[PDB]
């Protein structure tokens, strides 16, 4: 019943980097695993007993116990070593997990490429008006996306679907989706996307007219 504090949720580092990931039990106990699992696949035992390496894993991985601090230690990252992790206390007590630890990459400060997409006609025949603003090829995550309907700020109807590691440069592509009604679609013609990013410190605002 002793829970597990998986820290961090995710992180980013490049090939040939030293990655230390600390999970933390609710109590001061010994009996902790470490996993890895690419999506849609079975997991793998990286580190058994929180200090020892399981056979069948490349030797750029080690574990360490420091009192309550339970640390997965990666000496050197690899291009295939970008996958979801999981730490695991085990007793006869019921076993909990963490939420997953994703390994991502470090890259230079990259300003996004911002696209936009008016809704189609059959969306209005389905009761849908969506506008899809698309940041692309930016690293790191720090950006700001603000909707503008005829120069008026919007919030509360968008979702940020962010893709995974890009096949081009190992960047990430973000998408925001302004969901409104046709009564607000035909009314507001100016659909501006006020993007502000670290690399794109001068903000760019890709717009269209309905």
């Amino acid at each position: 019943d002793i829970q597990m504090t998986q820290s961090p949720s995710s992180l980013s580092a490049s090939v040939g980097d030293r990655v230390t990931i600390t999970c933390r039990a609710s109590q001061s106990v010994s009996a902790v695993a470490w996993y890895q699992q690419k999506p849609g696949k079975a997991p793998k035992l990286l580190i058994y007993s929180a200090s020892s390496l399981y056979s069948g894993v490349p030797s750029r991985f080690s574990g360490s116990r420091s009192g309550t601090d339970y640390t997965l230690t990666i000496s050197s990252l690899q291009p295939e070593d970008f996958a979801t992790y999981y730490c695991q206390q085990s007793y006869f007590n019921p076993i909990t997990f963490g939420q997953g630890t994703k390994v991502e990459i470090k890259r230079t400060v990259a300003a996004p490429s911002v696209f936009i997409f008016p809704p189609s006609d059959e969306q209005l025949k389905s009761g849908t008006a969506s506008v899809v603003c698309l940041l692309n090829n930016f690293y790191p995550r720090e950006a700001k996306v603000q909707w503008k309907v005829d120069n008026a700020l919007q919030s509360g109807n968008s979702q940020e679907s962010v893709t995974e590691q890009d096949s081009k440069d190992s960047t990430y592509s973000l998408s925001s989706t302004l969901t409104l009604s046709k009564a607000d679609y035909e009314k507001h013609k100016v659909y501006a996307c006020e993007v502000t990013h670290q690399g794109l410190s001068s903000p760019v605002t890709k717009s269209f007219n309905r």
Binding site: A31, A33, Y48
Partner: peptide, 12 residues
């Protein structure tokens, strides 16, 4: 045979 060692799996 380990303290937390659950190594093999299936496809699910």
């Amino acid at each position: 045979s380990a303290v937390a060692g659950l190594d093999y799996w299936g496809q699910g």
